């Protein structure tokens, strides 16, 4: 009953999407042509229609402005098991320009998307949240999803609008207008999102490459890593256990402000089939894995900054005991910083199922996971960071009239600096 | 389904193109009858951005070949991959342009350009999604030079939304080459500034040196020039014609490699290069693609790029590879050579990867760079221009056929302001 | 010619 | 040699070309083992008392 | 003893009859030489081919076709088809020249004499019945044999039968898509002709049709006979309450007098749902609430006409399948939910529900998928009247100049007759105004 | 009662009166002769009309100017019976963009019959609200003639409102070279004797009708229409009954700060596209947002580098105070419509009953609300100062002074204007400090 409606949105949100629905059908035991292997239940509810036949169709909108990536997977093993609609693919890209896919080339999709959203949540009784891949880089993410979200909100009230984003990173970078993209969208979807999980590909790489042992790492890691990442999130509306934190209230158990809904993730039994087994990974010892300046999805660390809330979801035959004993021993740590006014800064969530393990990528079949989900003051660094690139790009006028020939005011940029300035001092606000 | 239509003119056009239909149709498994000897679904999945689909299983280059004489285009029909272009776009002169821009521009070759219009009309409106254009011509030459800015103009006006691409090939600094030379490059970069959205230039003699000292041949051979032009093209397009993890077409080029609306002037370089002994002797890693590909002496422009600073930098890269290397490689070489990029853009790299490779190779990686170094470019046709345009020499020709001083000192000052704000740009700081 | 190449151009020098 | 010179780029101008990109090579069919975990009269005899 | 007559005129007319002919032998079991399989035994007598075959005594079924047109090829195409020994061969009436795309010609010259031939057929057709209901008589406004000899027939038949209900299924011209350039004239004087003698027309555009196909079948290029066979499996949804079991049964006469209001708004639209492909009916669940929700989505319709600019008189809808009036009412009191669609203020109850038991059949070889369940929605609303007035601003342009009336004039019609017709549609035109209102 | 006299000088002035009494009558429905049209308690034309004898409404307006033609395709058009003829003053010879051969010259020869004119219409009237001139800032006879006409009637009339409708001259699209010259000319000699006055550019209008009303080709025409629009909403309240009705004798008490800022902005919603109206039911809040945008003002002025002063709100049509509340409570709670420290209530809201008027081939569609927002904002400062730069770069060697010496204007008063334009730059700054 507690469906939830994802929408892949842009090349990585494609990417993330064809990992992430193989990890769904995975935990469920979905077959790539759709069907239950004979019967040896409700859990795929939540992300799965069942036609009638014996047929799931996922409750999955994969919309790219570029072809050849929504073909691919048109064309790839997960072919029979998307309906031929959901896959939306344009004719011609963005191109890396937020003006191009929110103002000429996204108006002429936004209406087929939308009323492919509608028909899903018609066929929907109790839809919980929209979980909105996409880039922050630019083009179809940064742009088209921020037209996406805007127009959700004006259609849908006070539905769930998590993000998932791909944020990007203090040194590594594959584009030269993403200081701009990011600018923009973090203007225009401050008011419309509800949560906004960032990730950061540098970060992954450091992490695959430290505890995964993969010094020749991809995107296919990266998505599957994010994949454990977002199930791990939506595990509680699918699978029973002792205590379950649904997405209309984690917000109410994280965000504090409605204009701070930035928070980190953290996913720590990420340790490799080669060490794996000969360690004790129990829930105190993944607690201090999660609270690790060097395990974090992002890179900003957060010695730097404050926590003003956390919350910890935890799956397997993991206990409350250890639980709360795992907490008080973190709470009790002078390296682990929280702010004044959240004594009790804790939530956690206890889930019965235990990881599934992907026959083909690099994490182990583990007993017990956890996936931190942080509320630090340590992204306004990586905030002060997008103003300074963009400050010093827009004070000579690089790379802004691709946008006012696409058709944009000059003033929005302006306008843009203002909010990341406005959010700047809120969270400065926040921190003393 | 994209698509990009060829407009190869004069002869270097025509003999560069006849090399760029036999590359980019051994990548898609195309004989020279036109049929289809391919294996993978990936060569016919988007074979529709530069082959029309005709009767059977042949298909036809989209590509009209435009000379205003009749040799090198039966060359290019007698010739292999010749019998593969339709033998309609065939639109040929009887007179010859004689090197001349003005006899390219304002003469016969003004009057066979209402039927190229007509053919490029036909050929672009037998699309559904049209990508853009791609100009291949030479800026010293006659009808390339000539009408084939004319035809820039023309389609530039007729539609100013798609791409526009124009593979120019640059004069030599040192020989002579054409008489008139700095004259018709001149009057063609000045038509070249305002109605093209990315222009990559293109040095005879850097493809010489690149020829002599990394592939270590004897004879040069224009084939071979061609060849390694048609390659450069190929990795340019690779986008378009093949998936990858991070695709980037010829207007995310054009949007992250050109910061100001004036200054598409690129110089391009594809360095999996090696001599031919020596290929099986030689790893084929992601940093030493990177360091092959980051170096002055495998420029195809000339114009030394430690002469000054990078603007933008892209890289497509071809093959079966790790973003983590490859984001680690540019973030390397922007650490180490960080006076030789402006501070005032941050990560000048943009990354593209198609994971296809071209036959034969397990990894190849195209350059294109956007950089200050290219006004001395500018600098020296000016100077010229001006050797030869306070001395009145070989100016009555131009004033036979029709246009004069004041358009001279037109595209003169044009190059001025040019080469004034590539120089700003380069010593312009931060604060 | 070179007072109305210095009269015409959008940014002269010398 | 006017058509230019055979080799150049890559010396092998043969073994066609590859067919396999990254997703199709990463995301594949789910193999799963059959190691057969849970015993064979305990099975045959758990679906007979279910029925 | 339920039994209906099929009058098919006109090349679109007759190769209407063609897809669904082949349609009720498929749903009535007839394979295509007249006769009824072999190993057929089974209780009841299999007695529902009444409203379409009639039983010789001999296991030949005889259809209850009136396949007329006054050119002879598509008609000799049939009768050397596949179903030569199907149909009877005095039953395929064929002229010497066709009325040339001319209402005159087909109203007043050599279309008027087959006239009395094609009575005699009508009537041998129906004493031959015992308990008529209807007669679906199938043409287009195109011209010619379909308008002219089609009106002059229908005018015969109101003096002939009474008031039986002569349900009339057109193929009205296209807003863009065009094929003659007297489709104007002969549709007005088709429309003025047919207003006092029809009761209920469904009209279909090719046009619409055409994006129907191209959008939910998926299938780039079809034609004619794809169009056909989906117009064949609209009148098989509404005549299978007259032949098959129902939960609510909806036969002709409840179904004009809950549709119609005033006997001059007797011009409804045509939808069927699904119309969907195998490829994508494995994937939708294509549940009741679906297809009713696909029925009042604009560019779905049948005729080129969104009914988001006007109001919904009254509903009917024919369900067919493993369908609920439970989830029938559910699905209505969506629909009345929906701001967009929006119903007239003196018709509170305006929907008419009917439940047949029977599943669509699927014809072999056609593109439509095998759903187990069906809707067919038949709206009547004042959404019409831009049609009307596109056809009528043609007919102004075309009269201003007085072109092609010279044909006309010469083959008999009188001048006066135009007027006439213009006058009769502007006054049907204030009156969908002051019923819309 | 609550008469209104609209006085039309310049050519601008009278192609917006010609549209401006075309929405008129189409409102108050009367045919072109001046008649009605056989009936069909009803004395709402009384605002704008006076019924003479035997049903014989002549519009209360008077179309003054010096230059012929422009004034004979009203005396030789469809409206030819509807204008009284000692109305409709036409002259011999143009001002020819020159405003002071509008004012110390040959449009002396006019201002006493024009008074005279302004003086019977106001003998008729029984409580005259004011007056509205409506003239452009380009030059000549809507210049000089205007600003005299102004200075007359502040002479004679006393307070008398003077609502004054102009067209400002547009940034970039631009059809006059002596209008830096003009337009401060007028200021100078406008500013003392005006109450309120509508500047209304060009190019924002066109803008306008390339974005919302998606065609590419719209003349003067629709201009004027869309301009005549604007003066409907503001005197429909006069005329129809409301909710909310405010006259021409508190807008200003509601805009105007002190006795030199009435310098407001014009705006509407929702102006829409005749052949795109039914896909959506335009809301109240949407359109208060759409007044708002930084886009839909008719004059090319950013409000972003702006705070505002006080705003009017017009609505119009199907709408109800409590969809007012929510408006502009969500406007105030919006951080880019920044208002100023000092006035921290800062709207009057006016609902008024019947609908906007669609004309008959116009452009616009029939739409169930509407609001037209005027705001006294600060950023009106930066056109100011586009325009004095203007005039200095181009009063700097003396450019077309000649002109203005030999029809009598000598040369202190261009530094007068110049001065006192710089004061009023100064007042801006030092209210937005
Ligand atoms: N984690 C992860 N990130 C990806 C992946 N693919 C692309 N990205 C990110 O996407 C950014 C590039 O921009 P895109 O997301 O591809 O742009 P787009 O959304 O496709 O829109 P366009 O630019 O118009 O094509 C890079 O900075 C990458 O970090 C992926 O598979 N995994
Ligand atoms: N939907 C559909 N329409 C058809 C079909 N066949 C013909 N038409 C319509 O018929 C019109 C052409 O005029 P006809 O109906 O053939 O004329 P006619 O009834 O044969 O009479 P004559 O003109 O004398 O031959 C076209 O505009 C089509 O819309 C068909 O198979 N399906
Ligand atoms: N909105 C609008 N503005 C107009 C119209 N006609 C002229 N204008 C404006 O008027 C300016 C030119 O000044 P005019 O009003 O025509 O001059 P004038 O009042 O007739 O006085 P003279 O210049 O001496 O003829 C132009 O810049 C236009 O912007 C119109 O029909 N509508
Ligand atoms: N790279 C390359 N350059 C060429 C080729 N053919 C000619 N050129 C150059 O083009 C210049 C002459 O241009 P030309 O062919 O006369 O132009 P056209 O008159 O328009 O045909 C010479 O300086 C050559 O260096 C070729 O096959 N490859
Ligand atoms: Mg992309
Ligand atoms: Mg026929
Ligand atoms: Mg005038």
Redesign the pocket.
């Given at each position: 009953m507690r469906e939830c409606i994802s929408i892949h949105v842009?090349?990585?949100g494609v990417?993330?999407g064809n990992a992430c629905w193989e990890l769904y059908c995975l935990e469920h035991g979905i077959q790539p042509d759709g069907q239950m292997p004979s019967d040896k239940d409700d859990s795929f509810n939540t992300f799965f229609s069942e036609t009638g036949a014996g047929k799931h169709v996922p409750r999955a909108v994969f919309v790219?402005?570029?072809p050849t990536v929504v073909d691919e997977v048109r064309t790839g093993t997960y072919r029979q098991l998307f309906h031929p609609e959901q896959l939306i693919t344009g004719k011609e890209?963005?191109?890396?320009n937020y003006a191009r896919?929110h103002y000429t080339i996204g108006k002429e999709i936004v209406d087929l998307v939308l009323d492919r959203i509608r028909k899903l949540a018609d066929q929907c009784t109790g839809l919980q949240g929209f979980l909105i891949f996409?880039?922050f880089?630019?083009?179809?993410?940064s742009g088209f999803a921020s037209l996406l979200m805007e127009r959700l909100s004006v259609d849908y009230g006070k539905k769930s609008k998590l993000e998932f984003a791909?944020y990007?990173a203090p040194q590594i970078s594959?584009?030269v207008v993403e200081p701009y993209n990011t600018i923009l969208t973090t203007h225009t979807t401050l008011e419309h999102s509800d949560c906004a999980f960032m990730v950061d590909?540098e970060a992954?790489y450091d992490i695959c490459r430290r505890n995964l042992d993969i010094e020749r790492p991809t995107?296919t890691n990266?998505?599957r890593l994010?994949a454990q990442i977002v199930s791990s999130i939506t595990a509680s509306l699918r699978f029973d256990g002792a205590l379950n934190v649904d997405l209309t209230e984690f917000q109410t158990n994280l965000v504090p402000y409605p204009r701070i809904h930035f928070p980190l993730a953290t996913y720590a039994p990420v340790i490799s089939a080669e060490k794996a087994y000969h360690e004790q990974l129990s829930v105190a010892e993944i607690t201090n894995a999660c609270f690790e300046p060097a395990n974090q999805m992002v890179k900003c660390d957060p010695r730097h900054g404050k926590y003003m809330a956390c919350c910890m979801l935890y799956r397997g035959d993991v206990v409350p005991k250890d639980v709360n004993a795992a907490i008080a021993t973190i709470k009790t740590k002078r390296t682990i910083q929280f702010v004044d006014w959240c004594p009790t800064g804790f939530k956690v969530g206890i889930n019965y199922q235990p990881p599934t393990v992907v026959p083909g990528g690099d994490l182990a079949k583990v007993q017990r996971a956890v996936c931190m989900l942080s509320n630090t003051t340590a992204i306004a660094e990586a905030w002060a960071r997008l103003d300074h690139k963009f400050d010093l790009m827009y004070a000579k006028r690089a790379f802004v009239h691709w946008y006012v020939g696409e058709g944009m005011e000059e003033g929005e940029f302006s306008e843009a600096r203002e909010d990341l300035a406005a959010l700047e001092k809120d969270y400065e606000e926040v921190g003393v | 389904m994209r698509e990009i239509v060829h407009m190869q003119a004069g002869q270097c056009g025509n003999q560069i193109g006849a090399k760029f239909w036999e590359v980019i149709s051994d990548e898609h498994g195309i004989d020279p009858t036109g049929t289809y000897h391919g294996d993978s679904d990936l060569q016919l999945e988007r074979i529709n951005v530069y082959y029309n689909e005709a009767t059977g299983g042949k298909y036809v280059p989209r590509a009209v070949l435009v000379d205003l004489e009749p040799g090198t285009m039966d060359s290019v029909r007698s010739g292999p991959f010749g019998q593969i272009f339709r033998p309609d776009n065939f639109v040929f002169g009887q007179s010859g342009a004689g090197n001349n821009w003005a006899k390219g521009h304002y003469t016969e070759g003004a009057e066979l350009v209402d039927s190229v219009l007509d053919v490029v009309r036909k050929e672009a409106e037998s699309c559904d999604c049209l990508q853009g254009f791609q100009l291949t011509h030479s800026l010293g030459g006659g009808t390339g030079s000539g009408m084939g800015t004319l035809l820039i103009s023309k389609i530039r006006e007729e539609y100013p939304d798609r791409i526009m691409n124009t593979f120019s090939v640059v004069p030599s600094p040192k020989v002579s080459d054409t008489v008139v030379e700095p004259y018709n490059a001149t009057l063609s970069v000045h038509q070249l500034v305002e109605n093209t959205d990315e222009t990559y230039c293109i040095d005879n003699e850097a493809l010489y040196d690149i020829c002599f000292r990394t592939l270590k041949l004897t004879t040069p051979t224009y084939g071979d020039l061609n060849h390694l032009v048609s390659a450069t093209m190929s990795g340019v397009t690779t986008c378009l014609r093949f998936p990858g993890?991070?695709?980037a077409d010829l207007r995310?080029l054009a949007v992250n490699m050109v910061p100001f609306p004036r200054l598409h002037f690129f110089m391009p370089g594809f360095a999996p290069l090696t001599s031919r002994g020596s290929q099986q002797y030689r790893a084929l890693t992601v940093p030493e693609l990177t360091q092959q590909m980051f170096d002055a002496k495998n420029m195809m422009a000339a114009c030394d790029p430690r002469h000054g600073r990078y603007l933008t930098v892209a890289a497509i890269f071809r093959g079966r590879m790790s973003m983590k290397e490859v984001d680690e490689q540019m973030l390397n070489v922007q650490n180490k050579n960080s006076s030789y990029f402006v501070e005032w853009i941050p990560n000048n790299v943009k990354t593209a990867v198609c994971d296809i490779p071209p036959r034969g190779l397990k990894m190849s990686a195209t350059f294109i760079g956007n950089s200050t170094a290219i006004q001395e470019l500018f600098k020296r046709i000016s100077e010229q221009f001006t050797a030869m345009f306070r001395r009145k020499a070989f100016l009555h020709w131009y004033t036979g056929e029709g246009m004069d001083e004041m358009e001279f000192t037109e595209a003169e000052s044009n190059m001025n302001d040019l080469v004034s704000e590539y120089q700003q740009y380069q010593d312009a700081t931060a604060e | 010619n070179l007072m109305y190449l210095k009269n015409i151009a959008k940014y002269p020098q010398w | 040699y006017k058509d230019g010179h055979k080799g150049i780029l890559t010396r092998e101008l043969d073994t066609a070309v590859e067919k396999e990109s990254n997703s199709m090579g990463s995301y594949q069919r789910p193999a799963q083992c059959g190691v057969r975990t849970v015993g064979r009269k305990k099975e045959l005899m758990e679906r007979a008392l279910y029925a």
């Open positions: 842009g090349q990585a990417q993330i790219d402005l570029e890209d963005a191109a890396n896919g996409h880039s880089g630019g083009g179809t993410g791909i990007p594959t584009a590909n992954i995107y990266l998505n994010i | 993890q991070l695709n995310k | - | -």
